[PDB]
Amino acid sequence: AXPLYISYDPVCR
Amino acid sequence: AMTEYKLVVVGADGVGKSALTIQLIQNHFVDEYDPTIEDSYRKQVVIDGETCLLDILDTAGQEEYSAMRDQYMRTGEGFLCVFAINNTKSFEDIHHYREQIKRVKDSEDVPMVLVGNKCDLPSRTVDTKQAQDLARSYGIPFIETSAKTRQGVDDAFYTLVREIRKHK
Ligand SMILES: Nc1nc2c(ncn2[C@@H]2O[C@H](COP(=O)(O)OP(=O)(O)CP(=O)(O)O)[C@@H](O)[C@H]2O)c(=O)[nH]1
Ligand SMILES: [Mg+2]
């Protein structure tokens, strides 16, 4: 989930 | 050049992130007139004899892109990780927020405070033994607050500033 959407977080990518 | 502390408030939907911030900034409990969008706020306060400026990001809209959130998660100096004492699922999410902060700060050493909000409610489902054991495993303070009555609110933010002061 992230949990937050952060553009440079590899898990979000 | 007054010291500035950059703080970020994170946690599951509905735990009281905005309520905690709005009590400190505006001296009232959140109502239908307060905005619901993610934003940052500034407040001059005196903490342990030091007059300082707090710059606080109140996170919201967690699944959507936010240029502000991208900037402020990297520059944030301390994080309030909030759960609600009547919602076990929000407490179970804490470790995910903490792991994300460490991943984006690229560090194992990030100032943080664990906050159990809604302590005015009788329907406690998260025992303080479980929350204190989690905070102790991370080496961080644990505080219980009620944004509704304002109990512990100022102390939660002052405790986080005290943790940031130990980073340097
Ligand atoms: N009983 C009680 N209710 C609270 C407390 N703090 C917040 N609430 C209630 O919880 C709900 C969410 O509060 P809010 O401050 O908007 O939470 P939030 O985490 O910013 C919500 P979002 O993630 O969508 O931005 C509201 O109905 C509010 O009245 C508290 O300390 N006690
Ligand atoms: Mg909010």
- B66, B74, B93: residue with CB nearest A3: B93
Per the structure block, which two tokens stand in for B49?
């004899």
Determine whether the interchain pair B10/A4 forms a contact, defined as Cβ–Cβ distance below 8 Å: yes
- Give the angle B5-B101-B143 at the CA atoms, nearest 5°: 65
Amino acid at B129: K
Alpha-carbon span A7 to B65, nearest angstrom: 7
Give me the residues near ligand 2 (ion), CB cutoff below 5 Å: B 17-18, 60
Q: For residue A3, which residues of chain B lie inside 8 Å, CB to CB?
A: 10, 12, 62, 93, 96-97, 100
Both structure tokens of B83: 């759960």
This structure's resolution (angstroms)? Answer: 1.3
**Burial class of residue B132, CB neighbours in 10 A (0-12, 13-18, 19+):** middle
Q: Is the peptide bond before A3 cis (omega within 30 degrees of 0)?
A: yes
CATH code assigned at B101:
3.40.50.300
Domain count, chain B: 1
Which residues, 6 or more positions from B149, have their beta carbon under 8 angstroms from its beta carbon? B120
User: Is B104 close to A8, i.e. CB distance below 8 A?
Assistant: yes
Mutate to test the interface with B, among A6, A11, A12 (most CBs of B within 10 A): A6
Nearest to B146 by CA among B66, B86, B67, B78: B86
The C-alpha of B24 sits at a distance from chain A's nearest C-alpha, in angstroms, of: 23
Contacts of B63 in chain A (CB under 8 A): 2, 5
B96 touches B131 (CB < 8 A): no
Spatial distance between the Cα atoms of B124 and B140, rounded to a whole number of angstroms: 22
In terms of Cβ atoms closer than 10 Å to its own Cβ (0-12, 13-18, 19+), residue B64 is exposed
- The shortest C-alpha distance from B39 to chain A (Å) reads 15
Which numbered atom of ligand 1 lies nearest the CA of B62? 23
List the structure tokens of B113.
């405070």
Residue B15 belongs to domain spanning:
4-167
The DSSP bridge pattern shows strands B3-11 and B78-84 to be parallel
